[PDB]
Design a binder for this molecule. Structure first.
Ligand SMILES: Cc1cc2nc3c(=O)[nH]c(=O)nc-3n(C[C@H](O)[C@H](O)[C@H](O)COP(=O)(O)O)c2cc1C
Ligand SMILES: COc1ccc(Nc2ccc(Oc3ccccc3)cc2)c(C(=O)O)c1
Ligand SMILES: CCCCCCCCCC[N+](C)(C)[O-]
Ligand SMILES: O=C(O)c1cc(=O)[nH]c(=O)[nH]1
Length: 367
């Protein structure tokens, strides 16, 4: 069934799977299989070249699974087995909520893209907290061994107080996380991205950071802000300013886009939702570049958006990312894409005269 092998997955297994299952069903199955550890052998051995020290942690490799794949913290261990250097779970909302009605995920095969409007379907903080607690010491050892865990926090659709939603997330899941993500960037919850402008963003993040600072040292995560690729130059300037003013630990750049770039071919291109995958790639990379420059290279960036190769990863790294994430590439190429990206990244680093990933971070800005 599953042997096992970049070409077999890309050319045969995944196309067949996608012919049989709609994207959300495939997503549910992928989560189930991953949680059981039913995966092809991750042959790739991580070299010292790929190791990154950032956010107060060691990362065995700079390739993570983006938020949204494991929304409820169900497959964390299987994701490490897949070869990810770090795992981000979420977004998690304070209370459980169902998200949007189905269908709410759409493939754009011709574009190597996906559009989703899940709408923060979440088991909620309490369920995710107990799920994480069940493996807390296991995670502590994984983190020690260079495999950190991120938790992405959302807010409920019907919440009257957005900042309090995030504050609850910090208090409940913060003690279980190496880093937290304040997701102010979903396409798919009304109002949400408006948390990205200035005086209100400052208010929100001050509250978040205060809650984080009130956790015991051993349970005190880094706090990152995940931003949209659709921000105005003014928005980006404002975010960079608040980030530096408040001492936000890092940025995740970017979420999905509500733009529909010219050239999309998929029949479903005009579905409502965030677009991910290849058509997002360079928009994300350019946002990384801008944010790195606006923060003077002093604020760690996790680069995400259309990464499916070593070149994609390195471009983001050279643009200013210390780490990268992918999601959409996994949906088309399956688990072997993780080793592929890592292998290609290591080769490109050597070819371009970099001693390791760390040496390449922001290299474009020094040209
Ligand atoms: C199906 C789907 C669900 C997602 N859910 C979340 C989410 O819950 N929280 C979040 O911060 N990002 C979410 N994302 C955005 C991804 O984390 C990532 O930022 C974006 O997809 C770009 O990366 P990619 O092109 O590699 O997929 C989701 C993306 C997709 C494809
Ligand atoms: C919207 O969110 C997703 C998530 C996973 C997907 N697919 C997928 C990802 C990993 C898989 O993992 C495997 C592959 C082969 C053997 C065992 C597990 C399988 C399907 C898809 C899709 O098919 O469109 C969509
Ligand atoms: C998730 C869709 C099914 C794809 C085929 C499953 C691959 C099983 C992996 C094989 N094995 C677990 C032994 O390595
Ligand atoms: O749950 C979702 O709809 C969602 C959240 C998010 O942050 N990004 C995204 O593309 N979808």
């Amino acid at each position: 069934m599953a042997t096992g092998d970049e070409r077999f997955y890309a050319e045969h297994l995944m196309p067949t799977l996608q012919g049989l299952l709609d994207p959300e069903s495939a997503h549910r199955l992928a989560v189930r299989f991953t949680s059981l550890g039913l995966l092809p052998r991750a042959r790739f051995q991580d070299s010292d070249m790929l190791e990154v020290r950032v956010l107060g942690h060691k990362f065995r490799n700079p390739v993570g699974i983006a938020a949204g794949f494991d929304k409820h913290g169900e497959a964390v261990d299987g994701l490490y087995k897949m070869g990810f250097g770090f795992v981000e779970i979420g977004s998690v909302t304070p209370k459980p909520q169902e998200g949007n009605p189905r269908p709410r995920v759409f493939r754009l095969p011709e574009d190597q893209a996906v559009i989703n409007r899940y709408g923060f379907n979440s088991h909620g903080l309490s369920v995710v907290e107990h799920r994480l607690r069940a493996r807390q010491q296991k995670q502590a050892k994984l983190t020690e061994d260079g495999l950190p865990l991120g938790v992405n926090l959302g807010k409920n659709k019907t919440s009257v107080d957005a900042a309090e939603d995030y504050a609850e997330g910090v208090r409940v899941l913060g003690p279980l996380a190496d880093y937290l993500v304040v997701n102010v960037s979903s396409p798919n919850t009304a109002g949400l991205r408006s948390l990205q402008g200035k005086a209100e963003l400052r208010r929100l993040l001050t509250k978040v950071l205060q809650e984080r600072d009130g956790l015991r040292r051993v349970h005190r995560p880094a706090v990152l802000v995940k931003i949209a690729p659709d921000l105005t130059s003014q928005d980006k300037e404002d975010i960079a300013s608040v980030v530096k003013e408040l001492g936000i630990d890092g940025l995740i750049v970017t979420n999905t886009t509500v733009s529909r770039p010219a050239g999309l071919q998929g029949a479903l291109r005009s579905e409502t939702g965030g677009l991910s995958g290849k058509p997002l790639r360079d928009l994300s990379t350019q946002t990384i570049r801008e944010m790195y420059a606006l923060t003077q290279g002093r604020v760690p960036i996790i680069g995400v958006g259309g990464v499916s190769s070593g070149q994609d990863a390195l471009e983001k790294i050279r643009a200013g990312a210390s780490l990268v994430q992918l999601y959409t590439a996994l949906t088309f190429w399956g688990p072997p894409v993780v080793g592929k990206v890592k292998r290609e990244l290591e080769a490109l680093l050597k070819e371009q005269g970099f001693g390791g990933v760390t040496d390449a971070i922001g290299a474009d800005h020094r040209r």
